A paper describes a structure:
The upregulation of [name] is involved with various types of cancer, and the high serum level of [name] is positively correlated with tumorigenesis, metastasis, and prognosis.
The overall [name] structure has not changed, indicating that [name] binding does not affect [name] folding. Globally, the inhibitor fits into a groove between two α-helices formed by residues 76–84 and 126–134. The covalent bond between [name] and [name] is clearly visible. The cyanimide moiety of the inhibitor reacted to active site Cys106, thereby forming an isothiourea linkage, which is similar to what has been observed for the reaction of cyanamide-based and azanitrile inhibitors with cathepsins. The isothiourea moiety is stabilized by an H-bond between the NH and the carboxylate side chain of the nearby Glu18. Another interaction is found between the thiazole ring amine in the inhibitor and the amide NH2 of the Asn76 side chain. From the structure, we observed an unoccupied space in the area surrounding the azide moiety of [name]. We reasoned that the structure of [name] could serve as a starting point for developing more selective inhibitors for [name].
Numbering used by the authors: 2 to 189
The structure:
């Protein structure tokens, strides 16, 4: 059976941090559901790219569980994820079932808001570090991608391919990740 990913898309999401993981995971044969936090209507991203979700989060929640739940960043997008009781319930269920949660740039601040993965080693964008580290609920990392068990974090648009390929490796293994990486023309 193909692995499955849920990507939660909120208004103000960083569109690169959304699209790069969706595209890379789909290249790996993962069945990705781009789920709109606000419903199936189009979502205006941080730099005004408008993405049409595959489903509402309400409907996508019904079709779990998922092998990974992915939280893009964006200042407003991560704020919206952080304020959502629906996101809180999905992340708590994913943590409880020992499923992977992956968040990039400002996205990890939604882990803090929902009390997910406390005591984990995490990274964030530098500009989100102080927010993430308020209260000392995590240990901080400067690694471009940090994987501490089932909590996978990363730093920014420029780490999005590394982040996505780490998700692919976690779900589908090293060889699939190498296959997907091969034609991307990534540096090293
Ligand atoms: C990646 N998706 N990024 C990196 C730059 C963008 C971002 O994180 N911008 C931020 N603006 C604020 C953040 S993060 C956190 N912040 C505070 O530290 C306020 N007090 N806090 N505990 C507010 C503004 C998106």
């Amino acid at each position: 059976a193909s692995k499955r990913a849920l990507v939660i898309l909120a208004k103000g999401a960083e569109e690169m941090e959304t699209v790069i993981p969706v595209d890379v995971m789909r290249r790996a044969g993962i069945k990705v559901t781009v789920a709109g936090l606000a419903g199936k209507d189009p979502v205006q991203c941080s730099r005004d790219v408008v993405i049409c979700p595959d489903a509402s989060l309400e409907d996508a929640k019904k079709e779990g569980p998922y092998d990974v739940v992915v939280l893009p960043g964006g200042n407003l997008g991560a704020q919206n994820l952080s304020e959502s009781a629906a996101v809180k319930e999905i992340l708590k269920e994913q943590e409880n079932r020992k499923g992977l949660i992956a968040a990039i740039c400002a996205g990890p601040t939604a882990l803090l808001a929902h009390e997910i993965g406390f005591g984990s080693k995490v990274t964030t964008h530098p500009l989100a570090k102080d927010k993430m580290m308020n209260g000392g609920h995590y240990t901080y990392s400067e690694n471009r991608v940090e994987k501490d068990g089932l909590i996978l974090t990363s730093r920014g648009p420029g780490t999005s391919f590394e982040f996505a390929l780490a998700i692919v490796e976690a779900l589908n293994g090293k060889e699939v990740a190498a296959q997907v990486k091969a034609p991307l023309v990534l540096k090293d």
